[PDB]
Design a protein around this ligand. Structure first.
Ligand SMILES: *[C@@H]1O[C@H](CO)[C@@H](O[C@@H]2O[C@H](CO)[C@@H](O)[C@H](O)[C@H]2NC(C)=O)[C@H](O)[C@H]1NC(C)=O
Ligand SMILES: *[C@@H]1O[C@H](CO)[C@@H](O[C@@H]2O[C@H](CO)[C@@H](O)[C@H](O)[C@H]2NC(C)=O)[C@H](O)[C@H]1NC(C)=O
Ligand SMILES: *[C@@H]1O[C@H](CO)[C@@H](O[C@@H]2O[C@H](CO)[C@@H](O)[C@H](O)[C@H]2NC(C)=O)[C@H](O)[C@H]1NC(C)=O
Ligand SMILES: *[C@@H]1O[C@H](CO)[C@@H](O[C@H]2O[C@H](CO)[C@@H](O)[C@H](O)[C@H]2NC(C)=O)[C@H](O)[C@H]1NC(C)=O
Lengths: 175, 183
């Protein structure tokens, strides 16, 4: 469906975050009160898959209209808060190779999506590494646990506590 | 001890003015919340920092431990004795928020701040107004800088007393921030 990018899309979309397998995460969304009827979180997995997939909610009382993720992410949970001056919604799931990708916040009608912001969750990536620097540097929430194979299946990654992506990834620098 | 005490050495996020929404005119007593959400970071503490429009100078902060989110210091307890905050751990980031009921007395400029004791990094700024000066169509939020309202249709208007409000000597400490944006 005819997609549009918010004025400040690339400049409030953090850089990729390398995350440990099995880590639980949440894609958080916040939009200022707005005229669209529906919001969705849109996922373009890095591993298998093509096209995209969306959890879609009624923009207002937040009901689930449609759950594209229900398959890859059978065990995720979403939330929806009414703040009056705006709304928060969110998708919570445990990260795997199978579920690392590009998650987006989308304002939505039937024909069109306005794309607010983009998260990129990686579990392996093809060297100092911080928690988030404002600015474009692949980061991690737990950089100190960062290991490194020369193999196929755990390429850098986070220790025990091409991609549909490499291009997006290749945009940003590694520290 | 510990009032007055604005942030000693403040810094602004690269994208501060360009992810700070315009002012939102809001009905008195509406209960609104202030968000934030930052991405896992290196600072020990976070704060929501408030500079009210009507009587108060310097600033006031709710301060939470950056990690499990406990309250370390509540500058707001006074003007906003009845507010509640929440803190969410998302792993790749955190959401924290201040919820209160808006009044003339408590409309101002609220900020999301990353914080040690000497410094604050200021992430983004919300401006909540209850009256707005006039010496007029109004939407819910347009991306871009146009004073908006979440319920524009409800928009009433007087001449001057306590200016546009919302239905059912000197200036503001805000008129300058407000004056930046277009109506
Ligand atoms: C989808 O959003 C678009 C843009 O907000 C709407 O369609 C554009 O809107 C302007 C204002 O009406 C028009 O001048 C353009 O011609 C529109 N384009 C099209 C193809 O319609 C539209 O209203 C929204 N979708 C629905 C289903 O209402
Ligand atoms: C301001 O907030 C207060 C409470 O935080 C609201 O009143 C409460 O509403 C809740 C939800 O229904 C009730 O559980 C409480 O019993 C109420 N307490 C009081 C003291 O009213 C109030 O509605 C909010 N302001 C407005 C204008 O609605
Ligand atoms: C509070 O944060 C500030 C800013 O990030 C820290 O000040 C920096 O510290 C580094 C390491 O000492 C210096 O090289 C920079 O000159 C400082 N930058 C600025 C802008 O001040 C500060 O050390 C932290 N404070 C405390 C008390 O831990
Ligand atoms: C990943 O998510 C699954 C379920 O979606 C979690 O499943 C358990 O272990 C947790 C850690 O100790 C406990 O907090 C839960 O109570 C427990 N759940 C049940 C039903 O017993 C799993 O924990 C998550 N991954 C990790 C590393 O915690």
């Amino acid at each position: 469906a005819e997609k549009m990018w918010a004025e400040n899309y690339e400049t409030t979309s953090p850089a990729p975050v390398l995350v440990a397998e099995g880590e639980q995460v949440t894609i958080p969304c916040t939009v200022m009160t707005h005229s669209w009827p529906m919001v969705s979180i849109r996922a373009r997995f890095c591993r298998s898959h093509d096209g995209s997939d969306e959890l879609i909610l009624d923009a207002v009382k937040g009901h689930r209209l449609m759950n594209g993720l229900q398959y890859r992410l059978p065990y995720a949970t979403w939330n929806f808060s009414q703040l009056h001056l705006g709304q928060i919604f969110s998708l919570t799931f445990n990260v795997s190779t199978d579920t690392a990708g590009m998650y987006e916040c989308v304002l939505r009608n039937y024909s069109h999506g306005l794309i607010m912001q983009r998260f990129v969750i990686l579990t392996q990536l093809e060297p100092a590494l911080g928690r988030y620097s404002l600015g474009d540097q692949i980061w991690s929430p737990t950089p100190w646990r960062l290991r490194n194979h020369d193999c196929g299946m755990y390429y850098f990654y986070i220790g025990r506590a091409p991609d549909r992506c490499w291009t997006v990834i290749q945009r940003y620098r590694l520290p």
